[PDB]
From a paper:
Here, we report the complete structure of a bimodular ∼760 kDa BoNT/A large progenitor toxin complex (L-PTC), which is composed of BoNT and four non-toxic bacterial proteins. We found that L-PTC/A consists of two structurally and functionally independent sub-complexes, the M-PTC and the HA complex. The HA complex is composed of HA70, HA17, and HA33 in a 3∶3∶6 stoichiometry and adopts an extended three-blade architecture, whereas the M-PTC is situated on top of the HA complex platform. BoNT/A absorption is mainly mediated by nine glycan-binding sites on the HA complex that together form multivalent interactions with host carbohydrate receptors on intestinal epithelial cells.
We also obtained a high-resolution structure of the blade by combining the structures of HA70D3–HA17 and HA17–HA33, which were determined at 2.4 Å and 2.1 Å, respectively. Based on the crystal structure of the HA70D3–HA17 complex, the interactions between HA70 and HA17 bury a solvent-accessible area of ∼795 Å2 (per molecule). The structure of HA70D3 is almost identical to its equivalent domain in the full-length HA70 with a root-mean-square deviation (rmsd) of ∼0.93 Å over 232 Cα atoms. The major HA70–HA17 interactions are composed of 13 pairs of hydrogen bonds and salt bridges. In addition, HA70-Phe547 is buried in a hydrophobic region in HA17 composed of Ile18, Ile92, Ala93, Thr96, and Met140. HA17 has a compact β-trefoil fold and connects HA70 and HA33.
Author numbering:
A (entry chain B): 4 to 146
B (entry chain A): 380 to 436, 451 to 626
The structure:
Amino acid sequence: ERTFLPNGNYNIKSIFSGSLYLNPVSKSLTFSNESSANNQKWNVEYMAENRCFKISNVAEPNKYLSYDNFGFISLDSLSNRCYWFPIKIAVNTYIMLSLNKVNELDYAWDIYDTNENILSQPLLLLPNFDIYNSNQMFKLEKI
Amino acid sequence: ENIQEINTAISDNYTYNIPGIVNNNPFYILFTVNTTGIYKINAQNNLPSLKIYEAIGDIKAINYITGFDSPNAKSYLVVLLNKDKNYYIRVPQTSSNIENQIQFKREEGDLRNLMNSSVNIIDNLNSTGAHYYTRQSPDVHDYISYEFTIPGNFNNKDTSNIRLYTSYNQGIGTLFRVTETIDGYNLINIQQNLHLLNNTNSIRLLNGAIYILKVEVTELNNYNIRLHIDITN
């Protein structure tokens, strides 16, 4: 009934490619070929008390999208690092800010690209300055 | 025309359910706000469009503020409301007996840039080519807005040429880029002083992005205002 990112299972993609899907691979998060498997499905849940979102892997329900001490997006047990503040900038396109601010800076999911190719690149948490950085834009598609 | 009344002065958020037994007639809602401020008012899916009137207190004066009456036209109102005065909402005929809801929300953010005007939801921009939209025109110095989405898939790169113009009435346009959070809309004022009457200048806008054009009528040459959005690639 909430139109802004309703709860449920999603696919997570980069705007660089509509065929690469976010999944965990050896502690790091990366965009890989369509698997039709549970590890590419993501349970998004809104938390009213914090006014933010937590996102878990459906293959590993206790594991949430978090970040470590070096700027890498990780899968970890629930904590304050798992809290996300999404910004919708297009139909299904989001910039995912961390609820936590260091400096007076916002930090967002960021994916490297090699001429719009993101294969093998790991998901990072990097400074966010505007709504125009392609590497910080992600599609969350309901399934 | 049964006049109904929200006896309690509303604050920040409020939801009023249409009875359903009053849908076969144009009907009115009398209300007041707890505190002076800018409010967004709309039906359930922005349908139907609503009219709002100012009421001075046996009454002294009633003044039309904003809103129109086009069947099947989606819209929402953004209006400055004073806690001292009264307000009427004219809800038109719901010639379909599904129960509607009127939502009132206090705006603390960028949507305040839209007072006072109706914001027309445009949802038929599926392609390139000519499109136009006819509504009752606001008087001089009054506003009418349009929220639309550029066709195509968004990739922060793919872009279309948008020609925005009017048929007869002169108007000054302000173009905003729309983003949304859990706290409502954010607006980036990307263009100002756009003279719409027979405007021949195009604007490149991002495919799949949402925009709002706020128009100030500066010359009323026709009862209606017709906004053209012609898209090329």
